[PDB]
Design a protein around this nucleic acid. Structure first.
Ligand SMILES: [K+]
Ligand SMILES: [Mg+2]
Ligand SMILES: [Mg+2]
Ligand SMILES: [Mg+2]
Ligand SMILES: [Mg+2]
Ligand SMILES: [Mg+2]
Ligand SMILES: [Mg+2]
Ligand SMILES: [Mg+2]
Ligand SMILES: [Mg+2]
Ligand SMILES: [Mg+2]
Ligand SMILES: [Mg+2]
Ligand SMILES: [Mg+2]
Ligand SMILES: [Mg+2]
Ligand SMILES: [Mg+2]
Ligand SMILES: [Mg+2]
Ligand SMILES: [Mg+2]
Ligand SMILES: [Mg+2]
Ligand SMILES: [Mg+2]
Ligand SMILES: [Mg+2]
Ligand SMILES: [Mg+2]
Ligand SMILES: [Mg+2]
Ligand SMILES: [Mg+2]
Ligand SMILES: [Mg+2]
Ligand SMILES: [Mg+2]
Ligand SMILES: [Mg+2]
Ligand SMILES: [Mg+2]
Ligand SMILES: [Mg+2]
Ligand SMILES: [Mg+2]
Ligand SMILES: [Mg+2]
Ligand SMILES: [Mg+2]
Ligand SMILES: [Mg+2]
Ligand SMILES: [Mg+2]
Ligand SMILES: [Mg+2]
Ligand SMILES: [Mg+2]
Ligand SMILES: [Mg+2]
Ligand SMILES: [Mg+2]
Ligand SMILES: [Mg+2]
Ligand SMILES: [Mg+2]
Ligand SMILES: [Mg+2]
Ligand SMILES: [Mg+2]
Ligand SMILES: [Mg+2]
Ligand SMILES: [Mg+2]
Ligand SMILES: [Mg+2]
Ligand SMILES: [Mg+2]
Ligand SMILES: [Mg+2]
Ligand SMILES: [Mg+2]
Ligand SMILES: [Mg+2]
Ligand SMILES: [Mg+2]
Ligand SMILES: [Mg+2]
Ligand SMILES: [Mg+2]
Ligand SMILES: [Mg+2]
Ligand SMILES: [Mg+2]
Ligand SMILES: [Mg+2]
Ligand SMILES: [Mg+2]
Ligand SMILES: [Mg+2]
Ligand SMILES: [Mg+2]
Ligand SMILES: [Mg+2]
Ligand SMILES: [Mg+2]
Ligand SMILES: [Mg+2]
Ligand SMILES: [Mg+2]
Ligand SMILES: [Mg+2]
Ligand SMILES: [Mg+2]
Ligand SMILES: [Mg+2]
Ligand SMILES: [Mg+2]
Ligand SMILES: [Mg+2]
Ligand SMILES: [Mg+2]
Ligand SMILES: [Zn+2]
Lengths: 206, 23, 60, 83
RNA sequence: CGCGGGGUGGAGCAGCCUGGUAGCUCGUCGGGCUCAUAACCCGAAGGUCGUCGGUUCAAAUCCGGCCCCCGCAACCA
RNA sequence: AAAAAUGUUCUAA
RNA sequence: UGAAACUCAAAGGAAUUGACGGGGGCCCGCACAAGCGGUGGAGCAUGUGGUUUAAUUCGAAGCAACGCGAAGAACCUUACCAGGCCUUGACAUGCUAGGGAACCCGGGUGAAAGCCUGGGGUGCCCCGCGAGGGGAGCCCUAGCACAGGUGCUGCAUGGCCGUCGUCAGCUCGUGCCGUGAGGUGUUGGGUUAAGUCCCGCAACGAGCGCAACCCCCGCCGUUAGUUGCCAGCGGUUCGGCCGGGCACUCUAACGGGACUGCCCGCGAAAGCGGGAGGAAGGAGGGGACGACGUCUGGUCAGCAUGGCCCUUACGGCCUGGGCGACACACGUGCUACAAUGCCCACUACAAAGCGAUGCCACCCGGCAACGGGGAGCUAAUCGCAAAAAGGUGGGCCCAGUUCGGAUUGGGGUCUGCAACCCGACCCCAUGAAGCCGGAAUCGCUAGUAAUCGCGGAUCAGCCAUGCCGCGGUGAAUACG
């Protein structure tokens, strides 16, 4: 184990933060804890919607949580009732005027955080781990991606001797700064332990 | 030496002040 | 002895000299920074995720 | 030592225990955990049981050990040397 | 109670003769080298000399008794 | 043209 | 000439990929050599073994465990020990029943926790000139479902990390060879810091690596001119202080700049030797960045997570103790053994950081730690602040000392509910070992080593001599 997080490595060159705001030392942590309490709620509720990225902006006693998502209709629900079922439960833990926004992700198979969640659920459903990887790396390449790489670590097929498996197509330059490599990790819990699913999507150089 | 607290040199070492290193 | 120690730390104590910082994320007691509410480990996990406003991997 | 701008420290709960005895014609065996309470002239002649972490050691208090703390007379570690 | 020799650090041997000074090799303990051990290298500790008694200012050393342990001898019928 | 011995049993994931 | 009993589940042949060699050849790394400073001896600081202990929680184990997790163990922390306590519980969502509360101020006992208690007074929509009767945040007592476990397994695991190694490598797709493992490519000639590039070639490409893109430092430009700066005229209590200006220095964003682009020489080429310009030359110096894999490496005690395990106890609260013990042994460091030094006084020159129960100017009390006053600053403005070595002047004169500052007595200060175990600092006195360290052993190739000081994280305080940073002064040496 040695490799550095491809997001933290590119933060400022290819990846903007998921929370953007300024806060003097006297309350950074408070807005930070709130930021985490929000993401916890939404990552729980909006799991079945295909959550990919929570943007949290903040300015003056108000906050603009922006949820990028695969199926936006799931988040909003009946005409904006399930959407506002959260717009207020959010504001019940926000206190602030917690504005909620929903964004459409152009391609789901081009979102590394979702590919990993897809493969993670496929192992929880006891699919063939080797097959389930080569299938996902296939979809990302068909969706135009310049290269993809997916990794399963753990007790593959419940084998006592845990193991690591992977597959990759195109190219994935982890050492390039100008490469835009979406990265997403998901955790797969099974009856024989927990499994790690890592997804690397080379989107292109800029 | 730096270990001798009763000197202007040892007081600089412990970062403290006294008769043997006033301000 | 862990969760009841996450709780006892939040509570106000019998004497202000009995208060200690805990990581708000994971509950760790050592190496917790005041500025974040986070230990040195969660500080590294959230930093790399980009969920820490304006913090960037330093280099000089 | 304690800044004498502040008082000489006795946990009060122990101090009651001894001033009642003087008033009522002392003395009872006094068992306390305040190893920190300074030996104070109202204690001479009494015997305090000091908890050293395991037991309450008796301590007969004399005039020549007043400026001290009670814990000084109930040691906490037993040694006996090495084999 | 026939004649010899011997008893001293843990083992095996000097020192006794010529009274004053305990020594050598291994072993034992602390360090070092080695991934580790051995070898090797650097340090250190341990013997009131079988025992009782005598001579002497002073006894492992000299003298007498006892204990222990090996060796020799025991011929003429 | 070479100072210098050795590495307990089962297991090789 | 030539058996048998008994016994094994193999013994074998060639070839393949590796690993290894006190085989070879060619290369590289502070690997040795050349140097300079240390460690190993001393006293002390800290981590560990061992012993001890009621407990001295637990993990880390050659390199790559040992100032490591610990970036702050007096109580808390705390996971250990003793004793006193709790039992749907400190914590989660759910169900009931009785109260029917919500919340805030007490009281008795007790070390505290705890147990026993005492006050007042809840809206919600309701029927209201009535009793109010209900219902509801949330409380509380009994009953359950369940919580809880830093208990065990890192040899069931995710995540993260160490390591080999910033070493130059590891492979794939098609084609070709081979019965097959597998080979070829990736080998060979040359070149590079590099599987870097060139030429060759049953191979032709491709991917992960290397490089590059990114950050700091070095020169120049644009853009800005306060809180920063003062070149030149005016004042000026002589302080950039006022006028005034942004030139400069700086501050911080965007740009330029170096590419073997140019000349000589070599070479088939890539490249290599030297030159010129140029602040900078051959990747300018430093960072970030770590291939396929290895080590059943490390972490269930950060977290997560399967399984096993405990359930008035292996959970929870408290007080006290312990984690700081000490016949010993090892690692990492601090301070030194002196004169290229020590001491006092005077006097210069930093950088990066921090600062609203914060940093504290200046003022008086005090030998001092500090205390009391008390401005300024939400900080290019006010403060921490003195930087130190250095420069000057003077004192010590080779002594266990005017070297060294351990140990111990007494007296205080301060943070803290509280400094007995077990804090830091200050002052009087005490003034140990140590005369340059056996066998052995470490780091560093340049603004490096060495030496000097300064700041930050943790933090009430602090056992920091540790760590992460910062500049000041500034070498020696590399034949090989
Ligand atoms: K005869
Ligand atoms: Mg099952
Ligand atoms: Mg002195
Ligand atoms: Mg937990
Ligand atoms: Mg605390
Ligand atoms: Mg803390
Ligand atoms: Mg003997
Ligand atoms: Mg002998
Ligand atoms: Mg002789
Ligand atoms: Mg003689
Ligand atoms: Mg001898
Ligand atoms: Mg030995
Ligand atoms: Mg090994
Ligand atoms: Mg050895
Ligand atoms: Mg000797
Ligand atoms: Mg005799
Ligand atoms: Mg003699
Ligand atoms: Mg005859
Ligand atoms: Mg043998
Ligand atoms: Mg077996
Ligand atoms: Mg063969
Ligand atoms: Mg050398
Ligand atoms: Mg030394
Ligand atoms: Mg030493
Ligand atoms: Mg121990
Ligand atoms: Mg453990
Ligand atoms: Mg410790
Ligand atoms: Mg500490
Ligand atoms: Mg504790
Ligand atoms: Mg406790
Ligand atoms: Mg085990
Ligand atoms: Mg592992
Ligand atoms: Mg692991
Ligand atoms: Mg272990
Ligand atoms: Mg290799
Ligand atoms: Mg092929
Ligand atoms: Mg063949
Ligand atoms: Mg064929
Ligand atoms: Mg092949
Ligand atoms: Mg290869
Ligand atoms: Mg090959
Ligand atoms: Mg190869
Ligand atoms: Mg080959
Ligand atoms: Mg390289
Ligand atoms: Mg080729
Ligand atoms: Mg300008
Ligand atoms: Mg790189
Ligand atoms: Mg292991
Ligand atoms: Mg577990
Ligand atoms: Mg755990
Ligand atoms: Mg030593
Ligand atoms: Mg140290
Ligand atoms: Mg040392
Ligand atoms: Mg300071
Ligand atoms: Mg002296
Ligand atoms: Mg001496
Ligand atoms: Mg002196
Ligand atoms: Mg004292
Ligand atoms: Mg203390
Ligand atoms: Mg001398
Ligand atoms: Mg030396
Ligand atoms: Mg070098
Ligand atoms: Mg010095
Ligand atoms: Mg501090
Ligand atoms: Mg101390
Ligand atoms: Mg410091
Ligand atoms: Zn944490």
């Amino acid at each position: 184990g040695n490799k550095i997080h491809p997001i933290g490595f590119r933060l400022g060159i290819t990846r903007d933060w998921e929370s953007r705001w300024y806060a003097g030392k006297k309350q950074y942590r408070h807005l930070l804890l709130e930021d985490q309490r929000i993401r916890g709620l939404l990552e729980k509720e909006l799991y079945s919607a295909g959550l990919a990225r929570v943007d949290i902006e903040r300015a003056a006693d108000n906050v603009a949580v922006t949820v990028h998502v695969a199926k936006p209709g799931v988040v909003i629900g009946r005409g904006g009732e399930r959407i506002r079922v959260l717009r207020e439960e959010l504001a019940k833990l926000t206190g602030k005027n917690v504005a909620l926004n929903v964004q459409e992700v152009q391609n789901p198979n081009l979102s590394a955080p979702l590919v990993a969640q897809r493969v993670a659920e496929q192992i929880e459903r006891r699919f063939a781990v080797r097959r389930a990887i080569k299938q996902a790396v296939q979809r990302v390449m068909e969706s135009g991606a310049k290269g993809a790489k997916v990794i399963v670590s753990g007790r593959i097929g419940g084998a006592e001797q845990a193991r690591t498996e992977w597959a990759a197509q195109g190219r994935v330059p982890l050492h390039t700064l100008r490469a835009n490599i979406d990265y997403g990790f998901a955790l797969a819990r099974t009856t024989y332990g927990v499994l790690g699913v890592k997804a690397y999507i080379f989107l292109g150089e800029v | 030496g730096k270990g001798d607290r009763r000197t202007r040199r040892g007081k600089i070492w412990r970062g403290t002040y006294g008769k043997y290193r006033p301000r | 002895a862990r969760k009841a120690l996450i709780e006892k730390a939040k509570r106000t104590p019998k004497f202000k000299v009995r208060a200690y910082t805990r990581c708000v994320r994971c509950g760790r007691a050592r190496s917790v920074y005041r500025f974040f509410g986070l230990c040195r480990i969660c500080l590294r996990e959230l930093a790399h995720k980009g969920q820490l406003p304006g913090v960037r991997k330093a280099s000089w | 030592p304690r800044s004498l701008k502040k008082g000489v420290f006795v946990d009060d709960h122990l101090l009651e225990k001894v001033l009642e005895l003087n008033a009522k014609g002392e003395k009872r065996l006094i068992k306390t955990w305040s190893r920190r309470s300074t030996i104070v002239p109202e204690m001479v002649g009494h015997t305090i049981a000091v908890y050293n972490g395991k037991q309450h050691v008796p301590v007969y208090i004399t005039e020549n050990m007043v400026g001290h703390k009670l814990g000084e007379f109930a040691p906490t570690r037993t040694y006996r040397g090495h084999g």
